[PDB]
Design a binder for this molecule. Structure first.
Ligand SMILES: CCCCCCCCCCCCCCCCCC(=O)OC[C@H](COP(=O)([O-])OCC(O)COP(=O)([O-])OC[C@@H](COC(=O)CCCCCCCCCCCCCCCCC)OC(=O)CCCCCCCCCCCCCCCCC)OC(=O)CCCCCCCCCCCCCCCCC
Ligand SMILES: COC1=C(OC)C(=O)C(C/C=C(\C)CC/C=C(\C)CC/C=C(\C)CC/C=C(\C)CC/C=C(\C)CC/C=C(\C)CC/C=C(\C)CC/C=C(\C)CC/C=C(\C)CCC=C(C)C)=C(C)C1=O
Ligand SMILES: CCCCCCCCCCCCCCCCCC(=O)OC[C@H](COP(=O)([O-])OCC[N+](C)(C)C)OC(=O)CCCCCCCCCCCCCCCCC
Ligand SMILES: CCCCCCCCCCCCCCCCCC(=O)OC[C@H](COP(=O)([O-])OCC[N+](C)(C)C)OC(=O)CCCCCCCCCCCCCCCCC
Ligand SMILES: CCCCCCCCCCCCCCCCCC(=O)OC[C@H](COP(=O)([O-])OCC[N+](C)(C)C)OC(=O)CCCCCCCCCCCCCCCCC
Ligand SMILES: CCCCCCCCCCCCCCCCCC(=O)OC[C@H](COP(=O)([O-])OCC[N+](C)(C)C)OC(=O)CCCCCCCCCCCCCCCCC
Ligand SMILES: CCCCCCCCCCCCCCCCCC(=O)OC[C@H](COP(=O)([O-])OCC[N+](C)(C)C)OC(=O)CCCCCCCCCCCCCCCCC
Ligand SMILES: CCCCCCCCCCCCCCCCCC(=O)OC[C@H](COP(=O)(O)OCCN)OC(=O)CCCCCCCCCCCCCCCCC
Ligand SMILES: CCCCCCCCCCCCCCCCCC(=O)OC[C@H](COP(=O)(O)OCCN)OC(=O)CCCCCCCCCCCCCCCCC
Ligand SMILES: CCCCCCCCCCCC(=O)OC[C@H](COP(=O)(O)OCC[N+](C)(C)C)OC(=O)CCCCCCCCCCC
Ligand code: SF4
Ligand code: SF4
Ligand code: SF4
Lengths: 318, 184, 176, 156, 115, 46
């Protein structure tokens, strides 16, 4: 029955990713005064299926002078880690109930940077290796603030257990006590996923190619699924972290409905932001992290270490 | 054909090599299977491959040549090679490791029988193995490419263009010409 | 008369400095940009339902070519070769000779629709309204040869679009 | 069954997938690129047919050659075409790409992009209206809907 | 067990999609294809990418900062101690030295990108 | 004896057409925004 549980998680994720491509093209469409896909199926509902079939029956070009082992490893690593990060999520009951679930999320997230690095190496292009180095430097910079921000929030929750964040917010959302941290967390999850205005590689098209410009067909599709699987997961993580839903043990479906709505709105906020702003220059988004976000995150880490002690509000360890 | 259309021109080429050929490209994808199986280690077969453009210019010159009506030609290359020393050259030009090993005729047909199950273009077949190892006939009594005003192109000149795509590095940095069976 | 676009001195009173600090820290003017795209999400899109709806055009539209006739069915063209002289792209080729009845008519009239720049000079030059650019703009082909029109194709277009070509000329000839 | 029935339906599935997800790489070379940008604009919104605004060469299905193709640019247009994964289609937009157009007799102009690459659809005009280009794309979908790749393979 | 099955399922599914992504489609390869995209023009040099020192310093700065975060991770468990005064002092000492490390790179032009 | 008729403006001309920049003021001042922000923190901490 546990193997049924795994499939009941993986398959819907790959369907949610499929229909996030439809919503992104229709929300961006209407925010640009047009309609988006509405011809392939009713209201475009079959568009993700057509795109899926199309990609997987196209030539999977691999340059002859590309390291085959790394060219294949990168999409497997990216998608494999993208699905792994979903297993500890309390929605409301985790598939795998980890005592250190939060630290597991960080640990797996930092491994995904390899797929960017391996793909750049395997291209043997040097129009993509620079893109990979720029992308990797961006990603590792912004997981510094994710860790310190996440550490600050856990000082009001008490543990790294993901389910304990539900108990912490049983009276009030953590966004009120920690709206300064939530703001930078939201931007930091935009830069980790290479989402606009932090998309210097995927779709910059400013004398800068993407690290996966050399991928075509199914292998490109796999990278796309990993990227979009992470967008939903990061926004589901934000809902649990700052917008905790009340959990009724007798009506657990009530939690899932409310928690599903919040995650969708946060995900649609990613689409909202892409339609509204230009993109940071690469050296500007490094100054955003090292000169603006990092000094403020450090100060709020000091403040959130001493605030429970000086208010006698230290959370329980269990 | 010679009876139905007596005035027809018949061209008999050896294995034709070129960018899209299945002759040099055939002795380069066998790397997918480790070593290179060759019946009798590829020593009892003599090959005289010809260039695609040479065969093409022969056909065109045969259209404008009134002397080609009701005539049979044999388009062959300028040099003769042993199947072993030609297959060695392909790997040398392609810069791929060369691990030849003999295989008996009955066993080589067995694996050819296996690849024939493919409902798509078979990678190899029993008939293909027979032709790869068949020695190219000498027909001195038939006009060649010299009677049509065509000079045969050595395989050495045009092997690099065919086998460039099989190499794994760009701007690697040479290979020696393959051994050739002298005439007579 | 000139005006300055970016010549201003920001005020330096604590009220104004704190407003700019609030904008820097609270992202106020970025969220104001999110409100402009939120409004568009709740407007009616300008998309039309092509091919069931079509974009508006005027009687002056210059589309696919056609050779016209008089009401009797006689060709209007009298092989004067004015359209061939004025054609800035040299897309018109004409050969003519006396017809069996002695009239001045063309034996070749080709428009290379791949040299043509759809400029309308041929219908301005024509003194008998023979060569016109019709209202059709939906004649894309699958081959380059289908776009080398000869006299038969152009006379078929005229007999095909006369009902609509005649109406457009009726609505614009007073401006010509 | 008959075998021909299964292959016939599989063709429809892959034909429907390929025409409903046409991802074009646009070679905006001259004025005809402007009319191509008006087809992406709200009124015609090519994105609503499954045709994305722009795609990189390695994920593009059709090349729209929109504008004059000069001799200097000709080598670069072939290189991009060779690197497009198959199936690949080419739409020649406008007179300049169709046959040379206004600059047919120039010393520096390729008299038609069909000299460099195969062309599946020719869209006439100088420029074609954004609607006449959308008619070409829709006319390319029907061409792909008539493909019989598997029916032919089944009868080999 | 349950964790190993989950990881195996996630990474086996990814591998399956890759194999059917390379074998299902119909292939046709030639030298003009299967070359680096570049931008439609031939490569202008047979040399690898020059080494940029600034990109090397961000990786090292992340590493050293990432090591100091490793020390800050056990803070939630550290706040449960009875020696809160000592714990609080060492918690703030670590974060302050992390900021002093940031201040050094900042003032020494370590965070700039202008050559 | 029909009169000349061509595209002309109506009698009295057309109505006035706005062209100057219009970016209306919105929101509160910096003091109020920080007061709401800190007040939210204080309620949350409590
Ligand atoms: C032969 C053949 O059958 O094809 C083999 C196939 C391609 O090799 P090939 O057909 O000989 O083509 C090479 C070119 O012809 C030759 O030219 P090329 O430049 O395209 O290929 C160069 C490539 C050659 O690579 C190989 O051929 C190795 C085989 O270079 C190498 O990678 C050296 C091999 C050593 C790889 C590391 C071991 O090799 C593969 O790429 C598949 C194996 C690699 C994928 C493994 C994925 C399973 C593990 C994922 C699940 C577990 C998660 C792990 C997460 C990551 C943690 C580290
Ligand atoms: C490089 O250009 C492009 C981009 O890059 C800027 C893009 O983002 C996009 C974005 C849009 C897409 C629709 C691309 C991805 C398409 C998919 C269909 C995603 C994969 C969907 C699946 C359902 C995977 C298959 C798994 C299943 C069905 C589980 C069982 C497009 C089109 C693009 O063209
Ligand atoms: C296959 C490809 C593997 C991809 C690498 C990433 C896989 C996840 C790594 C293991 C996750 C983890 O740390 O467990 C945390 C979690 C920590 O959770 P926990 O601390 O809350 O403990 C749960 C149970 N209690 C709380 C009661 C103690 O570990 C577990 O939940 C159970 C441990 C089981 C260990 C079995 C797996 C061992 C092998 C793992 C490595 C696999 C090989 C790696 C190959 C190389 C990869 C680069
Ligand atoms: C603040 C008011 C929010 C509404 C409310 O009152 O919910 C109360 C209720 C609260 O339910 P609850 O389950 O969280 O319980 C609240 C009590 N505690 C704190 C103890 C848990 O919300 C819901 O029940 C349903 C969720 C809908 C509201 C979620 C808002 C989050 C939106 C974030 C993204 C915003 C971007 C929007 C983009 C749209 C444009 C594309
Ligand atoms: C269905 C959807 C329902 C509505 C969902 C909410 C939409 C919110 C976005 C639209 C906002 C409307 C535009 C607007 O009023 O902005 C003008 C106003 C003013 O913009 P301003 O920058 O031009 O004002 C300049 C003048 N001073 C400096 C004096 C203010 O924007 C704001 O005031 C926003 C301030 C609050 C933002 C706080 C930071 C975000 C923190 C999030 C939690 C963490
Ligand atoms: C080798 C021994 C003979 C085994 C049969 C064989 O080689 O051909 C099987 C063939 C050879 O592969 P192939 O190279 O001819 O396939 C090329 C692309 N198609 C499928 C369009 C022809 O394997 C197959 O592709 C059969 C379909 C399975 C792969 C696709 C679906 C699952 C993934
Ligand atoms: C939902 C949880 C509670 C919120 C927790 C956060 C607490 C607030 C922390 C930010 C401090 C700044 C407080 C701003 C005070 C409100 C200012 C205001 O009235 O205008 C704001 C505006 C309304 O502007 P307005 O109504 O004042 O302007 C009208 C014009 N005047 C004032 C002249 C009459 O409301 C907002 O939308 C601000 C919230 C935007 C949130 C960001 C959008 C979500 C995108 C990601 C999801
Ligand atoms: C009422 C009272 C209210 C509080 C009053 C506080 C007043 C002190 C704080 C303000 C002083 C700030 C100094 C300053 O102005 O630095 C400017 C300078 C900017 O340099 P730069 O951006 O490169 O120049 C422009 C390039 N385009 O900066 C620099 O060149 C270097 C700046 C380095 C800063 C590093 C800080 C990182 C750590 C954040 C603080 C963490 C807490 C530190 C420990 C405090 C313990 C008490
Ligand atoms: C593991 C996968 C192994 C299969 C690899 C097959 C070779 C790669 C391939 O698919 O090419 C087939 C090739 C024709 O295709 P190709 O040369 O790649 O390019 C055509 C472009 N129009 O067809 C060919 O001409 C060569 C096909 C390979 C021949 C294999 C011969 C087998 C010899 C015995 C091997 C040992 C027994 C096992
Ligand atoms: C869910 C729990 C949230 C707790 C929030 C606690 C806030 C306490 C401090 C409020 C200060 C205050 O009210 O001052 C700020 C203003 C009052 O505007 P004013 O001073 O008249 O305008 C003067 C400024 N002008 C003339 C430039 C506009 O506030 C509000 O109207 C904020 C909206 C209501 C709260 C949400
Ligand atoms: S529209 Fe202009 S270019 Fe075309 S045939 Fe007429 S005169 Fe020539
Ligand atoms: S179409 Fe008109 S201008 Fe041209 S030759 Fe005929 S009558 Fe003269
Ligand atoms: S066909 Fe016309 S619009 Fe298009 S590039 Fe040529 S001159 Fe410009």
């Amino acid at each position: 029955m546990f193997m049924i549980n795994i499939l009941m998680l993986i398959i819907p994720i790959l369907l949610a990713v499929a229909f996030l491509t439809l919503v992104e093209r229709k929300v961006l469409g209407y925010m640009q005064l047009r309609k988006g896909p509405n011809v392939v199926g009713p209201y475009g509902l079959l568009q993700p299926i057509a795109d899926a079939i199309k990609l997987f029956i196209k030539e999977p070009l691999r340059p002859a002078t590309s390291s085959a082992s790394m060219f294949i490893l990168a999409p497997i690593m990216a998608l494999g880690l993208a699905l792994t990060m979903w297993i500890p999520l309390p929605m409301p009951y985790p598939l795998i109930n980890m005592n250190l679930g939060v630290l597991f999320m960080l640990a797996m997230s930092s491994l995904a940077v390899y797929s960017i690095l391996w793909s750049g190496w395997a291209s043997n292009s040097k129009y993509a290796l620079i893109g990979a180095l720029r992308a990797v430097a961006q990603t590792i910079s912004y997981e510094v603030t994710l860790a310190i921000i996440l550490l600050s929030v856990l000082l009001m929750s008490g543990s790294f257990t993901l389910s304990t964040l539900i108990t912490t917010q049983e009276q009030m959302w953590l966004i009120l006590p920690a709206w300064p941290l939530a703001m930078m967390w939201f931007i930091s999850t935009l830069a980790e996923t290479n989402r606009a205005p932090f998309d210097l590689t995927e779709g910059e098209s400013e004398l800068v190619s993407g690290f996966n410009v050399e991928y075509a067909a199914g292998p490109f599709a796999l990278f796309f699924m990993a990227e979009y699987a992470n967008i939903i997961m990061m926004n589901i993580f934000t809902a649990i972290l700052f917008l905790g839903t009340s959990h009724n043990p007798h009506m657990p479906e009530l939690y899932t409905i409310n928690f599903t709505i919040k995650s969708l709105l946060l995900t649609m906020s990613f689409l909202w932001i892409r339609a509204s702003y230009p993109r940071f220059r690469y050296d500007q988004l490094m100054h955003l992290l090292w000169k603006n976000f990092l000094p403020l995150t450090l100060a709020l880490c000091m403040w959130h270490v001493s605030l429970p002690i000086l208010t006698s509000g230290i959370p329980p360890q269990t | 054909v010679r009876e139905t259309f007596p005035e027809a021109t018949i061209i008999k080429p050896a294995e034709i090599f070129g960018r899209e050929d299945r002759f040099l490209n055939y002795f380069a994808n066998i790397r997918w299977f480790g070593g290179v199986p060759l019946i009798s280690l590829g020593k009892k077969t003599v090959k005289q491959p010809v260039y695609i453009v040479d065969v093409t210019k022969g056909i065109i010159n045969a259209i404008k040549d009134p002397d080609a009506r009701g005539k049979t030609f044999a388009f062959v290359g300028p040099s003769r090679y042993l199947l072993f020393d030609l297959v060695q050259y392909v790997f040398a030009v392609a810069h791929r490791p060369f691990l030849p090993y003999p295989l008996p005729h009955f066993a080589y047909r067995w694996i050819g029988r296996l690849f024939e199950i493919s409902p798509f273009e078979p990678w190899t077949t029993r008939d293909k193995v027979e032709r790869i190892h068949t020695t190219d006939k000498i027909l001195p009594h038939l006009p060649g490419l010299e009677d049509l005003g065509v000079e045969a192109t050595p395989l050495e000149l045009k092997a690099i263009e065919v086998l460039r795509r099989h190499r794994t590095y760009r701007w690697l940095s040479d290979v020696q010409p393959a051994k050739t069976i002298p005439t007579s | 008369t000139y005006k300055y676009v970016n010549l201003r001195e920001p005020s330096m009173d604590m009220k104004s400095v704190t407003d700019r600090a609030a904008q820097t820290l609270l992202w106020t003017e970025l969220i104001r940009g999110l409100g402009m795209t939120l409004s568009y999400l709740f407007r009616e899109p300008a998309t039309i339902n092509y091919p069931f709806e079509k974009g508006p055009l005027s009687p002056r539209f210059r589309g696919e070519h056609a050779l016209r006739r008089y009401p009797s069915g006689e060709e209007r063209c009298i092989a004067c070769k004015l359209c061939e002289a004025v054609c800035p792209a040299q897309a018109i080729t004409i050969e003519a000779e006396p017809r069996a009845d002695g009239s001045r008519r063309t034996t070749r009239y080709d428009i290379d629709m791949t040299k043509c720049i759809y400029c309308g000079f041929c219908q301005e030059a024509c003194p008998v309204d023979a060569i016109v650019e019709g209202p059709n703009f939906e004649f894309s082909t699958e081959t380059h040869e289908e776009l080398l029109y000869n006299k038969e194709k152009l006379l078929n277009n005229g007999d095909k679009w006369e009902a609509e070509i005649a109406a457009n000329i009726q609505a614009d000839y007073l401006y010509r | 069954s008959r075998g021909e029935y299964v292959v016939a339906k599989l063709d429809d599935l892959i034909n429907w997938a390929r025409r409903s997800s046409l991802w074009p790489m646009t070679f905006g070379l001259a004025c005809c690129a402007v009319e191509m940008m008006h087809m992406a604009a709200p009124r015609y919104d090519m994105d609503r047919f499954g045709v994305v605004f722009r795609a990189s060469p390695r994920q593009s299905d059709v090349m729209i050659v929109a504008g004059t193709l000069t001799n200097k640019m000709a080598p670069a247009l072939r290189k991009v075409y060779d690197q497009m994964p198959e199936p690949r289609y080419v739409v020649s937009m406008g007179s300049c790409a169709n046959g040379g157009g206004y600059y047919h007799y120039s010393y520096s102009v390729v008299r038609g992009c069909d000299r460099i690459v195969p062309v599946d659809i020719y869209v006439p005009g100088c420029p074609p209206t954004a609607e006449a280009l959308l008619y070409g794309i829709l006319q390319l979908q029907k061409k792909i809907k008539r493909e019989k790749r598997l029916r032919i393979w089944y009868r080999r | 067990m349950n964790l190993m099955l989950a990881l195996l399922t996630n990474f086996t599914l990814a591998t399956l999609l890759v194999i059917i992504a390379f074998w299902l489609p119909q292939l046709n390869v030639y030298s003009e294809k299967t070359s680096p995209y570049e931008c439609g023009f031939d490569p202008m040099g047979s040399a690898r990418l020059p080494f940029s020192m600034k990109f090397f310093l961000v990786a090292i700065t992340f590493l050293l900062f990432d090591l100091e975060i490793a020390l800050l991770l056990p803070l939630p468990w550290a706040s449960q101690t009875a020696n809160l005064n000592t714990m609080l002092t060492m918690a703030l000492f670590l974060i302050i030295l992390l900021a002093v490390s940031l201040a050094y790179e900042w003032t020494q032009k370590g965070l700039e990108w202008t050559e | 004896a029909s009169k000349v008729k061509q595209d002309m403006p109506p009698v009295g001309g057309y109505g006035p057409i706005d062209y100057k920049r219009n970016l209306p003021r919105r929101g509160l001042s910096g003091y109020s925004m920080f007061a709401v922000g800190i007040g939210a923190l204080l309620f949350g901490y409590w």
